[PDB]
Amino acid sequence: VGKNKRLSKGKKGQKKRVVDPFTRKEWFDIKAPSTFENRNVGKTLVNKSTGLKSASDALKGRVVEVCLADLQGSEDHSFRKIKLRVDEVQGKNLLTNFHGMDFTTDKLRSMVRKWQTLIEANVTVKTSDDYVLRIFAIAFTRKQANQVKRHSYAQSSHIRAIRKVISEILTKEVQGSTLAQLTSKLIPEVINKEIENATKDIFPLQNIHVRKVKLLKQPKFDVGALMALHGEGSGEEKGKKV
Amino acid sequence: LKEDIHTHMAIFEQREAQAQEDVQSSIVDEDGFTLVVGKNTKSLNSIRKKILNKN
Amino acid sequence: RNSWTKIYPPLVEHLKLQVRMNLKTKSVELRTNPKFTTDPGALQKGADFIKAFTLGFDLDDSIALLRLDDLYIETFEVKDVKTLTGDHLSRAIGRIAGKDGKTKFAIENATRTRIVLADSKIHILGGFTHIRMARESVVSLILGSPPGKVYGNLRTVASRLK
Amino acid sequence: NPSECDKLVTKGPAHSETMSTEAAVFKNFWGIKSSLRRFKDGSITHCCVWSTSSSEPIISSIVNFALQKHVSKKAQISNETIKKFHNFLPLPNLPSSAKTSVLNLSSFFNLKKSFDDLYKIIFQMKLPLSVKSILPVGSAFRYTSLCQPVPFAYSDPDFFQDVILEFETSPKWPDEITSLEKAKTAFLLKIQEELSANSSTYRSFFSRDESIPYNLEIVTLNILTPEGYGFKFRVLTERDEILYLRA
Amino acid sequence: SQVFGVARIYASFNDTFVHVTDLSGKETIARVTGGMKVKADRDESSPYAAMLAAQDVAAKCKEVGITAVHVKIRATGGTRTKTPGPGGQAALRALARSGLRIGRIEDVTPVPSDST
Amino acid sequence: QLLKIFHLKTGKVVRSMKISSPSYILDADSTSTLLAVGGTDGSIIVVDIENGYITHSFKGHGGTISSLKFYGQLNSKIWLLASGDTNGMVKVWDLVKRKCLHTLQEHTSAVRGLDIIEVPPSLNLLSGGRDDIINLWDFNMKKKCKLLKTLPVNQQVESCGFLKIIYTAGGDAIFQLIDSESGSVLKRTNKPIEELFIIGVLPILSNSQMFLVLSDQTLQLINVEEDLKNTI
Amino acid sequence: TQNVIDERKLRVQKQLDKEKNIRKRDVIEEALSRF
RNA sequence: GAGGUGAAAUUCUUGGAUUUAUUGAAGACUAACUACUGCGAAAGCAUUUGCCAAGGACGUUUUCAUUAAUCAAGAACGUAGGGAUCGGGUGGUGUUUUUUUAAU
């Protein structure tokens, strides 16, 4: 803080002056899976590539919370950021895979208002691979056209019907798919319109979203499958000259 | 095949719509009775084969 | 929509940036133009301008946030202190508003700041220690005090202001 | 171990100033074909490059050199079964595909890259009932085409892979099978019309189908892509299997 | 070609934090507070204190090499104010002015679902 | 904000320029009157120091810019610039025709420490890095090629090459002398008991004395011209 | 509650005027109608 | 340096406090939706799903035939009118809906 405040018996321990770590750090760049476009998402510091807690295994656990507008180049979904788990380090390029998805909180806090009721659902579902997802879904009552009453409330025995049909159909949409297919069908926001089409029979149902996919168990690595999700590659020679 | 889909859809929507309104207003039976149709059902053949299947 | 004719000229010809009123997601997006727009913080100042206006202050108050850039905008809630069940919450907002807005306007003219208050969340804009003075007067009043006593306390705080 | 069975370099020990005993072991064991290289990350490792090939695995050449250096310089290694029905697979006319291995799937991955281009183009257009899910089902997409798909190969019967697309679950589909299949032809006509409208670098031509019997009016389209591959599009509807169960 | 850090601007009570990290979250770069610039102990939550703190962070991050900052404002969360104070906007205005490209302003303040 | 102080009795700010990016590498010529400075985006301005203002721009590059070097013999007509990088590359510019001579993308980390000399226009150069590769090139005036790599095990910062043809390297508080045209460390100082390493080498009296400024705030003297004719 | 009843009167007025306006008022697309 | 206040102070912190990220465990609570709305005899009652029983209103050309009310003792638990809304039913006839899978 300053000179007049206190010594406080903790500054007597001496300071171990300077290590200058950014001369030692190293830049990697991240390659997203090829379900998206624009797979280069940015760069990451790690450590110096030495032995004794090496770089390629001090890596490969982290996540990056990138924005879907930054992945797709289209500002129609500025919300719905995703989380990519960096998994296989391969020649300066962190090959990553899908790990989660969440709305930026301003979007749902501006979606929810009073004089309407919202519906929540969430299932634990295994995909066709051995991933398991606590996949969520949010829903909202539409004020019907030519309405008069301010309310637009659900009868809470329609709520069980809407939640049953929404858990059933998104359980079907997960279980008939793999994780890459789940991302490539979640990106152009189509289970939302599928919920609205299969659920407009019972209630009018303003904008539907999914807003959360949480992975709870991962199968194995399968290096070849992860390389198949991007493109192949074979690290080979550079000249010795000594 | 464009003129084929044009002609086939043009006769099909016409016969479908006339069958739909024909089952939607088929009130008279010859002895007093009024056929219950149900909402937005499209065909007398459809309700006939449905009531044959529900045996 | 009713104040859009007075909002955008202090976003275009006074302050140098450009606006769009997106009806896609019902928002306002602001670009800065690389060709001729100066003032590298003007994007942030105009964003905070329309943020204060959509948050609830009036448009002259938001222009007062746009010019004279050192006025910030604090926000807090009724629900943090004493947990305020709904009948007492009605007592709370009625006690802060007074009668015909008179206690709120007293705090406004006293502590050189301007407040607005939603059903459970209030906002004060001004300078930073005036925000703190208004916030301690508001939290004393929402704890529940005689308005004559908070009038005398604001006489003392106005004497600190002079 | 079939994972790294055909990895074309063999990373031995790392390089330091003090030459370690395993580095000396590797030097004396390989010798004239050992080297020390930098990899792309930056580390330096003694290794041995191997010119891979399609008519062999590299383990043949490795055991050839590592026996003709150690057990005898005249001990002839004879194998011909692998060389005989390791190239009974048709050699795909690609850049350097004789030099590439057999576990390489880059022809399939190039086909899927062209499919992703077509995927984005078929999504971000507009339909009266938009695409719910387009997904491939073809043999190249399951990596079991006989020849590896080279671009512009017309005459292979496994050329036109089939991708299916399902639309939104709309109730306004017609009742009987000839009219709903004719509506599927209507939707395919719409998407090829807009495809020739906006993306002239692709092309489209229709095709009657006959494998599903007793409805001669099932029509697919086939996209000829500028990358060199073709795709056969089949529309699936929610009404189809309940129409067949009705029948 | 730009590269991106992540701000994690903490608009706490009686203090303000700014420390940009590379967008994983592990390798933090230049942790500053509101205390280590001003010398009074009364306004270590000052808007001016957060202002020159964000200026020093901008200088150090341009020294390292990151040019854009995805900015994420966090209040103190919990069963407390749940909403940024003045120090958050002060640091935001400072490092939006100081030659650093800004991306994706958010709010990552924790919400309780009625804890104690 | 670039400034220059004339070191003589007029100690006033002679010239002051507004440079684009906050820069962190400067080098003046082996002669006077040339000062090169490159920012943290791709822009390497060079300035005649007498009548101080911009004489070359050199947008040119990519990423933040690492160390660089001049090629200066008094009364020449060559006048090259070295121009290292953070993403590993060396893009050599001249100053008499404002052209990129040769683009070289071969490294893997920040290209610190590069040096240019001629041995009978031959003009061999040598570029170290935070990766452990010093990677000297032949570097003809028209079209260039490569020669040996000779790989020191350090993190080389300011590899002042071509001593009396013998290279230097620092970066673990270890001043390695390495022969050219073959690889052998032959003189190397005592590794200290700290972790702090070499920030900078500094040549005195035409590459005969060496100042060593550390990561710590100390600065040492070496006397290479005695300790090369000397082991350790 | 007065504001509630006023907003309901406004909505009923808007709906009556909307109903009043409602009462007072190529090949492949012909095949691809009704969807 | 963190904390904390009107200022402080105590405390914690180079054996790395605060902050950041990846997790894991523990108990309690059910943010926004939340209203002059719902239920219960009353106190009270807000996550989902299932089970176990119960209860209210409505519907009724179903049955019994005064079985009703009121409370000591005891017992269990702790003046007339109009608008709007919730639950049920009837009728109307437009859009949401849709069609031979069931439902309504």
Domains and CATH numbers, chain E: 1-116 (3.30.420.80)
Whole-angstrom Cα distance, residue A162 to residue A139? Answer: 9
Whole-angstrom Cα distance, residue C16 to residue C36? Answer: 8
Residue A242 in domain: no
Give the residues across from F94 on adjacent strands.
F80
D39 → chain F, closest CA residue:
F108
Whole-angstrom Cα distance, residue C29 to residue C21? Answer: 7
The two tokens of residue A46 are: 């790690």
> Counting Cβ atoms within 10 Å, is residue A230 exposed (0-12), middle (13-18) or buried (19+)?
buried
| All residues at 6 or more sequence positions from E78 whose CB lies less than 8 Å from its CB, including other chains | E110, E112, E115
Strands F209-214 and F198-204, bridge-based pairing: antiparallel
Q: Please, are residues A28 and A63 in contact by the beta-carbon 8 Å criterion?
A: no
Strands D230-236 and E28-32, bridge-based pairing: unpaired
Q: Please, are residues C155 and C162 in contact by the beta-carbon 8 Å criterion?
A: no
Angle between helical axes of A179-186 and A190-199 (0-180°, round to 10): 80
Q: Is D62 helix (H, G, I), strand (E, B) or coil?
A: helix
The two tokens of residue D128 are: 């009266």
Of the candidates F135, F126, F128, F111, the one whose C-alpha atom is nearest the C-alpha of residue F62 is: F111
Q: Please, are residues E69 and E101 in contact by the beta-carbon 8 Å criterion?
A: yes
Distance from CA of G33 to the nearest CA of A (A): 18
Whole-angstrom Cα distance, residue D235 to residue C1? Answer: 46
Whole-angstrom Cα distance, residue A174 to residue A192? Answer: 13
Whole-angstrom Cα distance, residue D239 to residue D176? Answer: 9
Give the residues across from A27 on adjacent strands.
A45
User: What residues make up the domain containing A201?
Assistant: 23-231
Instruction: Specify the amino acid at residue A204.
Output: P
Whole-angstrom Cα distance, residue G21 to residue E91? Answer: 54
DSSP state letter for D15: P
Whole-angstrom Cα distance, residue A32 to residue D146? Answer: 31
The two tokens of residue F221 are: 């003297």
Of the candidates A64, A61, A59, A58, the one whose C-alpha atom is nearest the C-alpha of residue A42 is: A64
| CB neighbour burial string for D159-184, b if at least 16 within 10 angstroms, e if fewer | bbbbbbbbbbbeeebbeebebbbbbb
Q: Please, are residues F91 and F100 in contact by the beta-carbon 8 Å criterion?
A: yes
Q: Where are the alpha helices (DSSP H) in chain D?
A: 21-30, 58-68, 81-84, 106-123, 177-198, 240-246
Q: Where are the alpha helices (DSSP H) in chain F?
A: 224-227
Residue A10 in domain: no
Query: Which residue do the tokens 């009453």 mark?
Result: A149
| Residue closest to H6 C1′ by Cα | E42
- The gap between A157 CA and H85 C1' (Å) is 19
Which of E42, E73, E79, E82 to substitute to test the interface with C, most C CBs within 10 Å? E82
Closest to D182 (Cβ–Cβ): which among B8, B16, B42? B8
Q: Which stretch of DSSP H or E encloses residue D211?
A: none
Whole-angstrom Cα distance, residue F88 to residue F110? Answer: 6
Whole-angstrom Cα distance, residue C55 to residue C62? Answer: 10
Strands F219-221 and D203-208, bridge-based pairing: unpaired
- The gap between A135 CA and H80 C1' (Å) is 59
Instruction: Specify the amino acid at residue F45.
Output: I
Measured from the Cβ of residue D137, the count of other Cβ atoms closer than 10 Å reads: 12
Whole-angstrom Cα distance, residue D184 to residue D218? Answer: 8
Query: Which residue do the tokens 């048709």 mark?
Result: D90
Task: Give the total number of structural domains in chain A.
Answer: 1
Whole-angstrom Cα distance, residue C78 to residue C143? Answer: 10
Vertex D228: Cα angle to D227 and D234 (nearest 5): 100
Backbone angles phi, psi at F138, to 5 degrees: -75, -50
> Counting Cβ atoms within 10 Å, is residue A126 exposed (0-12), middle (13-18) or buried (19+)?
middle
Determination technique for this PDB entry? cryo-EM
Residue A181 in domain: yes
Vertex F187: Cα angle to F185 and F191 (nearest 5): 95
Report the phi/psi class of residue F192: left, alpha or beta, with left for phi > 0 and alpha for psi in -120 to 50: beta
DSSP state letter for F163: B
| All residues at 6 or more sequence positions from E14 whose CB lies less than 8 Å from its CB, including other chains | E44, E45
The two tokens of residue C5 are: 């004719």
Instruction: Specify the amino acid at residue A108.
Output: L
> Counting Cβ atoms within 10 Å, is residue A58 exposed (0-12), middle (13-18) or buried (19+)?
middle
Q: Which stretch of DSSP H or E encloses residue C64?
A: helix C59-66
Q: What is the 3-state secondary structure (H, E, C) of chain E?
A: CCCEEECCEECCCCCCEEEEEECCCCCEEEEECCCCCCCCCCCCCCHHHHHHHHHHHHHHHHHHCCCEEEEEEECCCCCCCCCCCHHHHHHHHHHHHCCCEEEEEEECCCCCCCCC
Backbone angles phi, psi at E74, to 5 degrees: -125, 125
Residue A27 in domain: yes
Whole-angstrom Cα distance, residue C66 to residue C6? Answer: 13
Residue A82 in domain: yes
Instruction: Specify the amino acid at residue C49.
Output: F
Residue A13 in domain: no
Pick out the nucleotide with least CA–C1' distance to A65: H21
Whole-angstrom Cα distance, residue A142 to residue D61? Answer: 70
Q: Please, are residues D37 and D45 in contact by the beta-carbon 8 Å criterion?
A: yes
CA torsion through residues E78, E83, E85, E89, sign:
positive
Whole-angstrom Cα distance, residue F180 to residue F184? Answer: 8
Residue A239 in domain: no
| Binary contact (E1, F63; C-beta < 8 A) | yes
Whole-angstrom Cα distance, residue D186 to residue B10? Answer: 13
Q: Is F30 helix (H, G, I), strand (E, B) or coil?
A: coil
* Chain D hits for G26, Cβ within 8 Å: none
Which regions of chain F does DSSP assign to beta strands (E)? 2-5, 13-17, 25-28, 35-38, 44-48, 53-56, 80-81, 90-94, 100-104, 114-116, 125-127, 136-137, 166-169, 176-179, 185-187, 198-204, 209-214, 219-221
* Chain B hits for G27, Cβ within 8 Å: 2-3, 6
Which of chain H's bases lie under 7 Å from a protein CB?
A: 1-16, 18-23, 27-36, 47-50, 83-88, 94-104
Q: Please, are residues E2 and A70 in contact by the beta-carbon 8 Å criterion?
A: no
